Design a protein around this ligand. Structure first.
Ligand SMILES: Nc1nc2c(ncn2[C@@H]2O[C@@H]3COP(=O)(O)O[C@H]3[C@H]2O)c(=O)[nH]1
Ligand SMILES: Nc1nc2c(ncn2[C@@H]2O[C@@H]3COP(=O)(O)O[C@H]3[C@H]2O)c(=O)[nH]1
Ligand SMILES: Nc1nc2c(ncn2[C@@H]2O[C@@H]3COP(=O)(O)O[C@H]3[C@H]2O)c(=O)[nH]1
Ligand SMILES: Nc1nc2c(ncn2[C@@H]2O[C@@H]3COP(=O)(O)O[C@H]3[C@H]2O)c(=O)[nH]1
Lengths: 171, 171, 171, 171
């Protein structure tokens, strides 16, 4: 049960081609991250060039300690794409820098396209880019700390800790 | 008990002829427990009394495989003290019982005072009292299992195995 | 395989999204092997070739539970190269065999060149080649058992257990 | 076999009074130290006040990888005592400082009383004091590196490593 995460990871890495969802492993890992962050929700944004122009897209949304994989995975049928100047997820991809944002909308990069479209309200957010040397592969983020006004310094170290592992998984 | 003999012996070759080395030993042991249990951190509360009134106090926090002892040692001036009727730590000291708590939010006894001060989110926990006869010397815990929703039965067995040693050392 | 799942997973959460992380992984694994085997240090020699001529070269030396990666990484300029007909390391690469050497002074193949240069005294050794098909990628060793005259049979089993993982990573 | 050193140490430490030779454990440990140092011989000097005046005395002599305990233990029937100004072992006790001495007799503190009496010739020597806070309990030392002209920097780190453990044993 403790070895689940590895059995699946050793499974996915010995079938050499990554055509078997490393996104299940990211999903499982984003569940645990929520529990120990007490983030209301966690997400992963895929980072791509299409076709010659960099962008951040939606991939995994609304991850909670128990949300089912299918309910979090957004297929290309209906995804939301951002240029890196639009939206605070884009800025992280662009700058390749980590961010603990205690109050969005006091943050100028903040886009509110998805709060309007889905009905959610984003207030807090930690965001961090997964980077394979040159490029950014994805942006992960935790939203809206529970029982508290912002994500703490301690919540940063925990987020960073899991992202070290997620970062390897997307390779 | 092969890898325990090796871990403990090697550990003991890393302890400078100095302090205070008896707590540097407990620390290093805890660092190794973190690895073996995939625990986010381990901690120790000292247990002492004042005129027959016992209490439990922070001593080592945030012990981790890459953590510094002087960073983990609580400064005597700034140590958080609990009476034994407040906290799981205090409860462990009172009852002299081991506990594998899978969700602190569903365990009365849990005190959120340190979480509020430090900013850390505590989810699950193993806790054990270190005793000398009818009196308690410390409470040791492993917080936040990293690769599963809670600490396993098997995890209890490992923790208990390494806490015979800490016990010995804390005398 | 409980404590292996935990050790490896936790280890992987300590690896910064940076290098070169594939060798920081091997390093950290080796640091953990040192603890589990009570080995004074572990090392890795890379194995490469030049026009069909293989050779074996220093890469990670003096890996230890409290050792720094940038101190253990051999500087490409100052790397000691062996042909495979010199050294136990070169012999392991040649034969593609595991060896538990209890006394290097009674094993021809042993080359004392590094001992002379570095000043270190090598006594006993486990050595194993990391392979990809019919070609060798590295040789990993645990030097100088600290709590016994030589590495045990049981020690072979642990080393071999953790070297399936390193193998995986070194691809 | 790897757990021998601990089984004997846990044995000697739970029978609380140290009236059962912690010198067997020091002896066993000084055997391994020789092997991995390639020191010709290792010794321990007990440090005492008799009666009101500090002194360094002989206790364990001529330790080799295989020398039997009885042959190394010098009973008070026939021991050699030094004031701390006489002899390079005394100076270490006095200064409480570590010393790698590449060529005695170029060292002014060097006494040659025992080379004359026993027949041995001391050339090289690493010496280090075991100190319980205030006082020095003993001085351990390695003599005459084999296959080399002095003890290296690497030999220092290994000596220090074992002495951390020996230092705890004498408590
Ligand atoms: N509902 C929902 N919104 C999200 C999630 N992750 C990110 N967002 C929002 O999508 C936005 C993308 O642009 P932003 O300005 O970075 O701010 C981001 C968040 O407000 C999620 O999991 N669920
Ligand atoms: N931040 C932090 N908190 C800890 C650590 N160890 C214990 N605690 C908290 O201290 C609390 C004391 O009360 P509790 O109900 O036992 O729950 C305990 C934990 O929530 C630690 O290492 N770090
Ligand atoms: N100082 C040092 N020497 C090493 C290390 N690993 C291997 N060696 C030495 O490098 C030597 C190469 O030849 P060998 O006969 O295989 O024996 C090997 C060891 O003696 C290490 O980590 N540190
Ligand atoms: N024969 C012998 N001499 C020793 C041993 N250990 C220390 N000595 C010598 O005893 C001497 C004590 O004074 P010194 O000047 O420190 O130098 C020391 C060494 O030369 C040992 O194990 N055997």
């Amino acid at each position: 049960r403790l070895e689940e995460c590895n059995i699946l990871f050793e499974l996915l890495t010995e079938i050499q081609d990554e055509a078997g969802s490393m996104e299940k492993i990211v999903h499982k890992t984003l569940q645990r991250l929520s529990q120990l962050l007490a983030a209301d929700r966690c997400s992963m944004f895929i980072c791509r060039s299409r076709n010659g122009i960099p962008e951040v897209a939606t991939r995994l949304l609304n991850v909670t300690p128990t949300s089912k994989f299918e309910d979090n995975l957004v297929n290309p049928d209906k995804e939301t794409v951002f240029p890196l100047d639009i939206g605070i997820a884009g800025w992280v991809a662009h700058t390749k820098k980590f961010f603990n944002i205690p109050d969005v909308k006091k943050n100028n990069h903040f886009s509110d396209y998805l709060d309007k479209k889905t009905g959610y309200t984003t207030v807090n957010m930690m965001a961090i880019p997964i980077t394979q040397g040159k490029e950014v592969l994805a942006v992960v983020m935790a939203l809206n700390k529970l029982n508290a006004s912002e994500f703490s310094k301690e919540d940063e170290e925990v987020f960073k800790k899991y992202l070290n592992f997620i970062s390897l998984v997307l390779r």
